[PDB]
């Protein structure tokens, strides 16, 4: 609001300060910092992918209808990286993980192509590679901008192969395995019952995450919805 | 005309707390005196507002004007109730686009069957928000008043009544 | 033809007919008066 | 036969009002538009503008087209009738005024309107400003006034007094009227050509601020 | 004191960034390595030059009787002097109390020759 | 209202009482005020045009603006006008930032509605956006210096009580008034800029009501425009 | 006229599909801001008449006022840019 400060040595002179400018500067710094951090995390992860000797692009990693070994490699890398994200102390996963790569709609559940159901001895990760390719099979509008009027106008008045498109696919896979990692968290914490319940209603993640994660997230930077 | 259980049972003049509009007319509903058009003195080329004068009898037990019970996703920009003694006043803010205007259901005679489709869709979902055991009555006419532009339809305030049933299972 | 005379005839007719009786537009009066002027 | 003097006067005043060049304000009747357009029907030279105002009776969404030499003929004709330079935006103003006139039926009172029926993709002020700022930032400031340049206040008192006597008969209120009206005209036409929604409300908030302070 | 400080001087020095006696004068009033930063808290002596740029750039009866009887640089300079004087005060805390006590003075200033200093000669207040 | 002053002599009870309609004296006050305001406005214009003449302006302002090539003259005149305005708000101040620059907009792509004159600092000094075509058309606008522009009783009263050489007409008076008013609004925008930041400049541009907040504090402690009140004909219905 | 009717028909939008539209409190404590700053923290190695002339060449209250409000506003700016939470200022003065 308004915060007036009185300065005097009887002659009294009082200045008025508008907190809106302080809020503006604070916000602008916050968005700049958050964007910087997000791009730093993306760069770090894609760099450890580069050190993962993937001489072939990620789309090609999905053209490998047969080679699920590197599919498991990338899945484990992403999952351990997210586990570090919510557990920076831990940089590694439980000893063994098993990987099965589904390849059809009847083997891929809508909404959750990636899943973790135990074979009663250890968790197995079912991922529909064709579904993931379909994720990456859509051209990304990297040409036209996407979206308060006054703040926006004022702020407007204020080398190996990678592209903005590739950054789009990297963000997509990061957030997808992030959602899968949330499901896995519900699993490891509150059993088959609750990871399945989180899968059905993802609102369950709300109450299950105020316990740990809130004490943050890539996607929290923006807020999303559908039109009308 | 007011009395009291007091032994004198004095006459109590029904003072009206507010000041109702003097020019009580509406080009959308010229005959309807209770209809008061008021194009707000402001797509804004066609911004709109209108007050309907009703009797407080259509008010419910929780001080709510009955018809309002089946409005969800209310396209109307603003809407709320007012009372000046028995009389009451519902004012609805709207603003079509420049090429959009709303027109009274009265004597519409509209040949565009799809516009009629959207109107009927609005009213049918409205009444669908009704509860099965709950019965409804209307005291003004055998229909519902509504105003509408081709793009969208906005219900008018109504002489609505909400009576609840009880089905003995 | 400078002005399609048919609509000019029709507009003049209908305007004068309603005036004799006692819906229109200013452009209609324009077309009727130019109907006149041409005649 | 008719009085070409009166017909010319009506046509000229009407175009002056439509073009917004004249800060003068005067009510126009149906008789006035009849006068003007009959003048056009009589002005063989201006019969090109006559066909234009005849075509304006159509759907009023059409934009008429004509060859370049036809264009400079129209421009010379309108300049001759106005005896002002003039441009095609003035022609579009004329056409839009004629359309907004025709589609408006007779009424006992004048309906006060804002300039529309121009161009096509609705535009806001914000991105308009974005584009303007970008282009101007990309354009080098051709001038440079250095130092705290002295103000050449004309200290000659008698010079100011002769200026004063020379401006004393001027009804300054008329000066306010003309200046404010021309400012509004230019602002609103720049909004219309830019296809940016003109916001009369904040324009008046300017006067409100003036009143407050 | 202000006139003396002007006299011995005889924002532009803060405009030329590479161009990186006041402290000795204030020391005399109340009684060494240098570095200049360009990015800033809200015997080496750090100098938040951007902050200093933000500083520098940013009775009627008697009167009528007298009638019948017939500066921006100043603000900038005094602001800079008061800032340098606060810096000298904190440096004095560093010298005469310790490094940790100097940091405690920086974090909290309630803990604090003085007459000559111009800071003690005026009071500044803040209102909600 | 009324004042009944008593004239008497203490020797005897003989007393005399005169009611005095304060309305006549309030009207005299109002008439003196309007005359003084008209005089001050006219003398401000006289000073402005006189310093323009001392600015070696040969061709009248109109074709100064028609002049595309002589951007030297355009910069000089805009700088002088803005100097005069700031002096009006700051009689003590008569000079500005050492370095100044001027940039001209010659098309719709470069010219904005509402504020043909703008500013957007290059982060080291402020640059003067000026839309030559807009002011060209502004002055080109035919003018109404013949039809007088406006309580009936007090109007008749001021009428009857009102007991009514270098080549210049009243048209150029209109022209210079318009220039001063446009530069006044632009200079208010730039005051907002210099005093609160570019973001605040932008928001005030988007919302001229903020000038009330930022200048009711400062400017009122008035405008050349504030002599009269201004509105739009039948604004009430216009709004709807 | 019928041609124009068709024109406007052509100028009408058609059906689309749903889209995930985009849309763009906590104050950092002094401790970590100062930690980072210090972590990120060497380049360089009487006259009486003149005093009177300096003196003659200003309401002291207003001058101290301007300086103090300048410093306070800059401190608030530094807090805002740093997200830092802002009484110690009064302890300074």
PDB file of N, CA, C and O in Angstrom, chain D residues 20-21 23-24 131-132 142-143 145-149 151-152 160 162 166 168 170-171 174-175 178-179 182 186 189-190 202 204 207 209 212, chain F residues 42 46 54 71-72 95 98-100 102 108-109 111-112 137-138 141-142 144-147 165 168-170 174 178 206 208 212 216 229:
ATOM      1  N   UNK D  20     -12.787  16.070 -40.131  1.00  0.00           N
ATOM      2  CA  UNK D  20     -12.361  16.565 -38.830  1.00  0.00           C
ATOM      3  C   UNK D  20     -11.327  17.674 -38.944  1.00  0.00           C
ATOM      4  O   UNK D  20     -10.811  18.124 -37.915  1.00  0.00           O
ATOM      5  N   UNK D  21     -11.002  18.137 -40.153  1.00  0.00           N
ATOM      6  CA  UNK D  21     -10.068  19.249 -40.273  1.00  0.00           C
ATOM      7  C   UNK D  21     -10.623  20.488 -39.586  1.00  0.00           C
ATOM      8  O   UNK D  21      -9.925  21.144 -38.809  1.00  0.00           O
ATOM      9  N   UNK D  23     -12.274  22.473 -36.871  1.00  0.00           N
ATOM     10  CA  UNK D  23     -12.672  22.401 -35.473  1.00  0.00           C
ATOM     11  C   UNK D  23     -14.071  22.954 -35.254  1.00  0.00           C
ATOM     12  O   UNK D  23     -14.632  22.764 -34.171  1.00  0.00           O
ATOM     13  N   UNK D  24     -14.640  23.626 -36.253  1.00  0.00           N
ATOM     14  CA  UNK D  24     -15.986  24.158 -36.130  1.00  0.00           C
ATOM     15  C   UNK D  24     -16.990  23.030 -35.941  1.00  0.00           C
ATOM     16  O   UNK D  24     -16.837  21.931 -36.483  1.00  0.00           O
ATOM     17  N   UNK D 131       5.288  -2.183 -30.470  1.00  0.00           N
ATOM     18  CA  UNK D 131       5.853  -2.016 -31.803  1.00  0.00           C
ATOM     19  C   UNK D 131       6.463  -0.630 -31.968  1.00  0.00           C
ATOM     20  O   UNK D 131       7.573  -0.482 -32.500  1.00  0.00           O
ATOM     21  N   UNK D 132       5.743   0.406 -31.524  1.00  0.00           N
ATOM     22  CA  UNK D 132       6.263   1.761 -31.663  1.00  0.00           C
ATOM     23  C   UNK D 132       7.582   1.908 -30.919  1.00  0.00           C
ATOM     24  O   UNK D 132       8.561   2.435 -31.460  1.00  0.00           O
ATOM     25  N   UNK D 142      18.268  11.619 -34.826  1.00  0.00           N
ATOM     26  CA  UNK D 142      18.978  12.429 -35.807  1.00  0.00           C
ATOM     27  C   UNK D 142      19.493  13.741 -35.228  1.00  0.00           C
ATOM     28  O   UNK D 142      20.383  14.356 -35.825  1.00  0.00           O
ATOM     29  N   UNK D 143      18.965  14.183 -34.090  1.00  0.00           N
ATOM     30  CA  UNK D 143      19.341  15.459 -33.502  1.00  0.00           C
ATOM     31  C   UNK D 143      20.055  15.266 -32.172  1.00  0.00           C
ATOM     32  O   UNK D 143      19.996  14.202 -31.549  1.00  0.00           O
ATOM     33  N   UNK D 145      20.904  18.119 -28.968  1.00  0.00           N
ATOM     34  CA  UNK D 145      21.054  19.421 -28.331  1.00  0.00           C
ATOM     35  C   UNK D 145      21.851  19.220 -27.051  1.00  0.00           C
ATOM     36  O   UNK D 145      21.406  18.521 -26.132  1.00  0.00           O
ATOM     37  N   UNK D 146      23.026  19.834 -26.994  1.00  0.00           N
ATOM     38  CA  UNK D 146      23.996  19.594 -25.939  1.00  0.00           C
ATOM     39  C   UNK D 146      23.910  20.676 -24.869  1.00  0.00           C
ATOM     40  O   UNK D 146      23.317  21.739 -25.069  1.00  0.00           O
ATOM     41  N   UNK D 147      24.506  20.379 -23.714  1.00  0.00           N
ATOM     42  CA  UNK D 147      24.525  21.304 -22.587  1.00  0.00           C
ATOM     43  C   UNK D 147      23.111  21.653 -22.139  1.00  0.00           C
ATOM     44  O   UNK D 147      22.130  21.264 -22.781  1.00  0.00           O
ATOM     45  N   UNK D 148      23.001  22.378 -21.031  1.00  0.00           N
ATOM     46  CA  UNK D 148      21.727  22.929 -20.619  1.00  0.00           C
ATOM     47  C   UNK D 148      21.440  24.180 -21.419  1.00  0.00           C
ATOM     48  O   UNK D 148      21.604  25.299 -20.924  1.00  0.00           O
ATOM     49  N   UNK D 149      21.030  23.995 -22.673  1.00  0.00           N
ATOM     50  CA  UNK D 149      20.951  25.102 -23.615  1.00  0.00           C
ATOM     51  C   UNK D 149      20.098  26.232 -23.054  1.00  0.00           C
ATOM     52  O   UNK D 149      19.007  26.009 -22.523  1.00  0.00           O
ATOM     53  N   UNK D 151      17.563  29.151 -22.532  1.00  0.00           N
ATOM     54  CA  UNK D 151      16.249  29.495 -23.067  1.00  0.00           C
ATOM     55  C   UNK D 151      16.334  30.922 -23.595  1.00  0.00           C
ATOM     56  O   UNK D 151      16.676  31.837 -22.833  1.00  0.00           O
ATOM     57  N   UNK D 152      16.053  31.165 -24.878  1.00  0.00           N
ATOM     58  CA  UNK D 152      16.100  32.554 -25.379  1.00  0.00           C
ATOM     59  C   UNK D 152      14.820  33.321 -25.070  1.00  0.00           C
ATOM     60  O   UNK D 152      14.051  33.719 -25.951  1.00  0.00           O
ATOM     61  N   UNK D 160       6.677  41.903 -25.999  1.00  0.00           N
ATOM     62  CA  UNK D 160       5.622  41.102 -25.392  1.00  0.00           C
ATOM     63  C   UNK D 160       4.321  41.882 -25.298  1.00  0.00           C
ATOM     64  O   UNK D 160       3.243  41.305 -25.458  1.00  0.00           O
ATOM     65  N   UNK D 162       3.267  44.337 -27.365  1.00  0.00           N
ATOM     66  CA  UNK D 162       2.657  44.395 -28.689  1.00  0.00           C
ATOM     67  C   UNK D 162       2.050  43.049 -29.060  1.00  0.00           C
ATOM     68  O   UNK D 162       0.937  42.992 -29.597  1.00  0.00           O
ATOM     69  N   UNK D 166      -1.951  42.523 -29.652  1.00  0.00           N
ATOM     70  CA  UNK D 166      -2.289  41.886 -30.909  1.00  0.00           C
ATOM     71  C   UNK D 166      -3.096  40.613 -30.700  1.00  0.00           C
ATOM     72  O   UNK D 166      -3.846  40.214 -31.598  1.00  0.00           O
ATOM     73  N   UNK D 168      -5.000  40.284 -27.737  1.00  0.00           N
ATOM     74  CA  UNK D 168      -6.071  40.585 -26.789  1.00  0.00           C
ATOM     75  C   UNK D 168      -7.457  40.361 -27.378  1.00  0.00           C
ATOM     76  O   UNK D 168      -8.299  39.750 -26.699  1.00  0.00           O
ATOM     77  N   UNK D 170      -8.428  38.224 -29.306  1.00  0.00           N
ATOM     78  CA  UNK D 170      -8.648  36.800 -29.507  1.00  0.00           C
ATOM     79  C   UNK D 170      -9.489  36.234 -28.366  1.00  0.00           C
ATOM     80  O   UNK D 170      -9.087  36.348 -27.198  1.00  0.00           O
ATOM     81  N   UNK D 171     -10.651  35.621 -28.646  1.00  0.00           N
ATOM     82  CA  UNK D 171     -11.379  34.910 -27.585  1.00  0.00           C
ATOM     83  C   UNK D 171     -10.723  33.591 -27.212  1.00  0.00           C
ATOM     84  O   UNK D 171     -11.027  32.544 -27.789  1.00  0.00           O
ATOM     85  N   UNK D 174     -12.436  30.278 -27.422  1.00  0.00           N
ATOM     86  CA  UNK D 174     -12.426  29.670 -28.746  1.00  0.00           C
ATOM     87  C   UNK D 174     -11.093  28.989 -29.027  1.00  0.00           C
ATOM     88  O   UNK D 174     -11.048  27.976 -29.731  1.00  0.00           O
ATOM     89  N   UNK D 175     -10.002  29.534 -28.487  1.00  0.00           N
ATOM     90  CA  UNK D 175      -8.695  28.916 -28.670  1.00  0.00           C
ATOM     91  C   UNK D 175      -8.648  27.559 -27.982  1.00  0.00           C
ATOM     92  O   UNK D 175      -8.179  26.568 -28.556  1.00  0.00           O
ATOM     93  N   UNK D 178     -10.845  25.130 -30.169  1.00  0.00           N
ATOM     94  CA  UNK D 178     -10.202  24.682 -31.397  1.00  0.00           C
ATOM     95  C   UNK D 178      -9.040  23.746 -31.093  1.00  0.00           C
ATOM     96  O   UNK D 178      -8.902  22.685 -31.716  1.00  0.00           O
ATOM     97  N   UNK D 179      -8.191  24.118 -30.130  1.00  0.00           N
ATOM     98  CA  UNK D 179      -7.011  23.315 -29.833  1.00  0.00           C
ATOM     99  C   UNK D 179      -7.402  21.939 -29.313  1.00  0.00           C
ATOM    100  O   UNK D 179      -6.882  20.916 -29.775  1.00  0.00           O
ATOM    101  N   UNK D 182      -8.940  19.796 -32.165  1.00  0.00           N
ATOM    102  CA  UNK D 182      -7.951  19.275 -33.106  1.00  0.00           C
ATOM    103  C   UNK D 182      -7.105  18.178 -32.466  1.00  0.00           C
ATOM    104  O   UNK D 182      -6.800  17.161 -33.106  1.00  0.00           O
ATOM    105  N   UNK D 186      -6.940  14.347 -34.044  1.00  0.00           N
ATOM    106  CA  UNK D 186      -5.716  13.642 -34.406  1.00  0.00           C
ATOM    107  C   UNK D 186      -5.544  12.376 -33.576  1.00  0.00           C
ATOM    108  O   UNK D 186      -5.183  11.321 -34.111  1.00  0.00           O
ATOM    109  N   UNK D 189      -8.199   9.722 -34.877  1.00  0.00           N
ATOM    110  CA  UNK D 189      -7.856   9.182 -36.189  1.00  0.00           C
ATOM    111  C   UNK D 189      -6.617   8.302 -36.105  1.00  0.00           C
ATOM    112  O   UNK D 189      -6.538   7.265 -36.769  1.00  0.00           O
ATOM    113  N   UNK D 190      -5.626   8.694 -35.298  1.00  0.00           N
ATOM    114  CA  UNK D 190      -4.462   7.831 -35.147  1.00  0.00           C
ATOM    115  C   UNK D 190      -4.851   6.497 -34.523  1.00  0.00           C
ATOM    116  O   UNK D 190      -4.262   5.463 -34.854  1.00  0.00           O
ATOM    117  N   UNK D 202     -10.136   7.185 -20.622  1.00  0.00           N
ATOM    118  CA  UNK D 202      -8.912   7.754 -20.063  1.00  0.00           C
ATOM    119  C   UNK D 202      -8.620   9.127 -20.656  1.00  0.00           C
ATOM    120  O   UNK D 202      -8.058   9.997 -19.974  1.00  0.00           O
ATOM    121  N   UNK D 204     -10.819  11.309 -21.118  1.00  0.00           N
ATOM    122  CA  UNK D 204     -11.531  12.198 -20.208  1.00  0.00           C
ATOM    123  C   UNK D 204     -10.893  12.205 -18.826  1.00  0.00           C
ATOM    124  O   UNK D 204     -10.945  13.217 -18.119  1.00  0.00           O
ATOM    125  N   UNK D 207      -8.924  15.155 -18.402  1.00  0.00           N
ATOM    126  CA  UNK D 207      -9.627  16.346 -17.932  1.00  0.00           C
ATOM    127  C   UNK D 207      -9.943  16.241 -16.446  1.00  0.00           C
ATOM    128  O   UNK D 207      -9.903  17.241 -15.721  1.00  0.00           O
ATOM    129  N   UNK D 209      -8.142  14.699 -14.179  1.00  0.00           N
ATOM    130  CA  UNK D 209      -6.901  15.008 -13.477  1.00  0.00           C
ATOM    131  C   UNK D 209      -6.675  16.509 -13.452  1.00  0.00           C
ATOM    132  O   UNK D 209      -6.355  17.095 -12.413  1.00  0.00           O
ATOM    133  N   UNK D 212      -8.803  17.975 -10.886  1.00  0.00           N
ATOM    134  CA  UNK D 212      -8.339  17.651  -9.542  1.00  0.00           C
ATOM    135  C   UNK D 212      -7.196  18.563  -9.117  1.00  0.00           C
ATOM    136  O   UNK D 212      -7.158  19.026  -7.972  1.00  0.00           O
TER     137      UNK D 212
ATOM    138  N   UNK F  42      -2.490  34.688 -21.718  1.00  0.00           N
ATOM    139  CA  UNK F  42      -2.099  35.398 -22.927  1.00  0.00           C
ATOM    140  C   UNK F  42      -0.652  35.861 -22.847  1.00  0.00           C
ATOM    141  O   UNK F  42       0.065  35.842 -23.850  1.00  0.00           O
ATOM    142  N   UNK F  46       2.453  34.970 -25.092  1.00  0.00           N
ATOM    143  CA  UNK F  46       3.267  36.036 -25.661  1.00  0.00           C
ATOM    144  C   UNK F  46       4.747  35.774 -25.425  1.00  0.00           C
ATOM    145  O   UNK F  46       5.565  35.908 -26.339  1.00  0.00           O
ATOM    146  N   UNK F  54      12.773  34.882 -31.129  1.00  0.00           N
ATOM    147  CA  UNK F  54      14.193  34.986 -30.814  1.00  0.00           C
ATOM    148  C   UNK F  54      14.937  33.687 -31.103  1.00  0.00           C
ATOM    149  O   UNK F  54      16.172  33.688 -31.138  1.00  0.00           O
ATOM    150  N   UNK F  71      15.502  18.938 -39.350  1.00  0.00           N
ATOM    151  CA  UNK F  71      15.343  18.368 -38.019  1.00  0.00           C
ATOM    152  C   UNK F  71      16.102  19.162 -36.965  1.00  0.00           C
ATOM    153  O   UNK F  71      15.749  19.093 -35.783  1.00  0.00           O
ATOM    154  N   UNK F  72      17.134  19.912 -37.359  1.00  0.00           N
ATOM    155  CA  UNK F  72      17.752  20.856 -36.435  1.00  0.00           C
ATOM    156  C   UNK F  72      16.697  21.780 -35.842  1.00  0.00           C
ATOM    157  O   UNK F  72      16.610  21.952 -34.620  1.00  0.00           O
ATOM    158  N   UNK F  95      17.298  25.468 -17.375  1.00  0.00           N
ATOM    159  CA  UNK F  95      18.133  24.629 -18.224  1.00  0.00           C
ATOM    160  C   UNK F  95      17.968  23.179 -17.792  1.00  0.00           C
ATOM    161  O   UNK F  95      17.545  22.891 -16.670  1.00  0.00           O
ATOM    162  N   UNK F  98      22.416  18.125 -19.594  1.00  0.00           N
ATOM    163  CA  UNK F  98      23.407  18.538 -20.580  1.00  0.00           C
ATOM    164  C   UNK F  98      23.102  17.935 -21.947  1.00  0.00           C
ATOM    165  O   UNK F  98      22.830  18.654 -22.913  1.00  0.00           O
ATOM    166  N   UNK F  99      23.095  16.610 -22.038  1.00  0.00           N
ATOM    167  CA  UNK F  99      22.910  15.943 -23.315  1.00  0.00           C
ATOM    168  C   UNK F  99      21.426  15.713 -23.565  1.00  0.00           C
ATOM    169  O   UNK F  99      20.685  15.308 -22.666  1.00  0.00           O
ATOM    170  N   UNK F 100      20.996  15.979 -24.796  1.00  0.00           N
ATOM    171  CA  UNK F 100      19.622  15.730 -25.200  1.00  0.00           C
ATOM    172  C   UNK F 100      19.610  15.252 -26.643  1.00  0.00           C
ATOM    173  O   UNK F 100      20.458  15.642 -27.451  1.00  0.00           O
ATOM    174  N   UNK F 102      16.804  13.888 -30.013  1.00  0.00           N
ATOM    175  CA  UNK F 102      15.459  13.975 -30.561  1.00  0.00           C
ATOM    176  C   UNK F 102      15.311  12.995 -31.714  1.00  0.00           C
ATOM    177  O   UNK F 102      16.182  12.897 -32.582  1.00  0.00           O
ATOM    178  N   UNK F 108       2.633   5.727 -39.525  1.00  0.00           N
ATOM    179  CA  UNK F 108       1.828   5.036 -38.523  1.00  0.00           C
ATOM    180  C   UNK F 108       2.654   3.975 -37.809  1.00  0.00           C
ATOM    181  O   UNK F 108       2.529   3.795 -36.593  1.00  0.00           O
ATOM    182  N   UNK F 109       3.510   3.269 -38.550  1.00  0.00           N
ATOM    183  CA  UNK F 109       4.366   2.261 -37.937  1.00  0.00           C
ATOM    184  C   UNK F 109       5.212   2.851 -36.816  1.00  0.00           C
ATOM    185  O   UNK F 109       5.585   2.136 -35.879  1.00  0.00           O
ATOM    186  N   UNK F 111       4.321   6.077 -35.323  1.00  0.00           N
ATOM    187  CA  UNK F 111       3.551   7.094 -34.618  1.00  0.00           C
ATOM    188  C   UNK F 111       2.417   6.438 -33.843  1.00  0.00           C
ATOM    189  O   UNK F 111       1.678   5.617 -34.394  1.00  0.00           O
ATOM    190  N   UNK F 112       2.267   6.824 -32.580  1.00  0.00           N
ATOM    191  CA  UNK F 112       1.286   6.204 -31.697  1.00  0.00           C
ATOM    192  C   UNK F 112       0.087   7.136 -31.556  1.00  0.00           C
ATOM    193  O   UNK F 112       0.261   8.363 -31.525  1.00  0.00           O
ATOM    194  N   UNK F 137      -0.755  17.279 -39.473  1.00  0.00           N
ATOM    195  CA  UNK F 137      -2.193  17.189 -39.696  1.00  0.00           C
ATOM    196  C   UNK F 137      -2.964  17.980 -38.646  1.00  0.00           C
ATOM    197  O   UNK F 137      -3.999  18.582 -38.952  1.00  0.00           O
ATOM    198  N   UNK F 138      -2.482  17.980 -37.401  1.00  0.00           N
ATOM    199  CA  UNK F 138      -3.088  18.790 -36.353  1.00  0.00           C
ATOM    200  C   UNK F 138      -3.258  20.229 -36.810  1.00  0.00           C
ATOM    201  O   UNK F 138      -4.372  20.761 -36.848  1.00  0.00           O
ATOM    202  N   UNK F 141      -5.525  20.999 -39.645  1.00  0.00           N
ATOM    203  CA  UNK F 141      -6.944  21.004 -39.327  1.00  0.00           C
ATOM    204  C   UNK F 141      -7.486  22.424 -39.404  1.00  0.00           C
ATOM    205  O   UNK F 141      -7.056  23.304 -38.651  1.00  0.00           O
ATOM    206  N   UNK F 142      -8.422  22.645 -40.325  1.00  0.00           N
ATOM    207  CA  UNK F 142      -9.154  23.901 -40.365  1.00  0.00           C
ATOM    208  C   UNK F 142      -9.622  24.266 -38.962  1.00  0.00           C
ATOM    209  O   UNK F 142      -9.875  23.398 -38.124  1.00  0.00           O
ATOM    210  N   UNK F 144     -11.797  27.052 -36.146  1.00  0.00           N
ATOM    211  CA  UNK F 144     -13.035  27.801 -35.934  1.00  0.00           C
ATOM    212  C   UNK F 144     -12.720  28.941 -34.977  1.00  0.00           C
ATOM    213  O   UNK F 144     -12.913  28.827 -33.765  1.00  0.00           O
ATOM    214  N   UNK F 145     -12.244  30.053 -35.534  1.00  0.00           N
ATOM    215  CA  UNK F 145     -11.884  31.233 -34.761  1.00  0.00           C
ATOM    216  C   UNK F 145     -12.953  32.317 -34.846  1.00  0.00           C
ATOM    217  O   UNK F 145     -12.656  33.501 -34.653  1.00  0.00           O
ATOM    218  N   UNK F 146     -14.196  31.930 -35.132  1.00  0.00           N
ATOM    219  CA  UNK F 146     -15.277  32.885 -35.342  1.00  0.00           C
ATOM    220  C   UNK F 146     -16.492  32.563 -34.479  1.00  0.00           C
ATOM    221  O   UNK F 146     -17.190  33.473 -34.021  1.00  0.00           O
ATOM    222  N   UNK F 147     -16.756  31.278 -34.256  1.00  0.00           N
ATOM    223  CA  UNK F 147     -17.938  30.840 -33.519  1.00  0.00           C
ATOM    224  C   UNK F 147     -17.593  30.757 -32.037  1.00  0.00           C
ATOM    225  O   UNK F 147     -16.851  29.863 -31.615  1.00  0.00           O
ATOM    226  N   UNK F 165       2.915  46.441 -35.672  1.00  0.00           N
ATOM    227  CA  UNK F 165       1.982  45.329 -35.545  1.00  0.00           C
ATOM    228  C   UNK F 165       2.347  44.213 -36.517  1.00  0.00           C
ATOM    229  O   UNK F 165       1.906  44.212 -37.666  1.00  0.00           O
ATOM    230  N   UNK F 168       0.124  38.630 -37.559  1.00  0.00           N
ATOM    231  CA  UNK F 168      -0.329  37.398 -36.920  1.00  0.00           C
ATOM    232  C   UNK F 168      -1.849  37.455 -36.823  1.00  0.00           C
ATOM    233  O   UNK F 168      -2.430  38.516 -36.586  1.00  0.00           O
ATOM    234  N   UNK F 169      -2.494  36.326 -37.071  1.00  0.00           N
ATOM    235  CA  UNK F 169      -3.921  36.187 -36.839  1.00  0.00           C
ATOM    236  C   UNK F 169      -4.155  35.392 -35.552  1.00  0.00           C
ATOM    237  O   UNK F 169      -3.222  35.060 -34.816  1.00  0.00           O
ATOM    238  N   UNK F 170      -5.421  35.098 -35.262  1.00  0.00           N
ATOM    239  CA  UNK F 170      -5.762  34.251 -34.128  1.00  0.00           C
ATOM    240  C   UNK F 170      -5.591  32.769 -34.439  1.00  0.00           C
ATOM    241  O   UNK F 170      -5.570  31.948 -33.514  1.00  0.00           O
ATOM    242  N   UNK F 174      -4.303  29.776 -31.976  1.00  0.00           N
ATOM    243  CA  UNK F 174      -4.808  28.417 -31.788  1.00  0.00           C
ATOM    244  C   UNK F 174      -3.684  27.401 -31.924  1.00  0.00           C
ATOM    245  O   UNK F 174      -3.591  26.448 -31.141  1.00  0.00           O
ATOM    246  N   UNK F 178      -2.350  24.838 -29.055  1.00  0.00           N
ATOM    247  CA  UNK F 178      -2.408  23.391 -29.218  1.00  0.00           C
ATOM    248  C   UNK F 178      -1.045  22.756 -28.981  1.00  0.00           C
ATOM    249  O   UNK F 178      -0.939  21.717 -28.316  1.00  0.00           O
ATOM    250  N   UNK F 206      -0.644   4.712 -19.740  1.00  0.00           N
ATOM    251  CA  UNK F 206      -1.816   3.853 -19.847  1.00  0.00           C
ATOM    252  C   UNK F 206      -2.983   4.353 -19.007  1.00  0.00           C
ATOM    253  O   UNK F 206      -4.132   4.004 -19.296  1.00  0.00           O
ATOM    254  N   UNK F 208      -4.035   8.009 -17.343  1.00  0.00           N
ATOM    255  CA  UNK F 208      -3.806   9.414 -17.035  1.00  0.00           C
ATOM    256  C   UNK F 208      -4.375   9.819 -15.683  1.00  0.00           C
ATOM    257  O   UNK F 208      -4.015  10.888 -15.180  1.00  0.00           O
ATOM    258  N   UNK F 212      -3.292  12.495 -11.519  1.00  0.00           N
ATOM    259  CA  UNK F 212      -3.915  13.073 -10.333  1.00  0.00           C
ATOM    260  C   UNK F 212      -3.142  12.689  -9.081  1.00  0.00           C
ATOM    261  O   UNK F 212      -2.880  13.528  -8.213  1.00  0.00           O
ATOM    262  N   UNK F 216      -1.395  16.067  -8.177  1.00  0.00           N
ATOM    263  CA  UNK F 216      -2.142  16.691  -7.091  1.00  0.00           C
ATOM    264  C   UNK F 216      -1.249  16.897  -5.880  1.00  0.00           C
ATOM    265  O   UNK F 216      -1.496  17.791  -5.064  1.00  0.00           O
ATOM    266  N   UNK F 229     -12.712  24.080 -17.453  1.00  0.00           N
ATOM    267  CA  UNK F 229     -13.041  22.665 -17.395  1.00  0.00           C
ATOM    268  C   UNK F 229     -13.401  22.179 -18.793  1.00  0.00           C
ATOM    269  O   UNK F 229     -13.916  22.934 -19.619  1.00  0.00           O
TER     270      UNK F 229
END
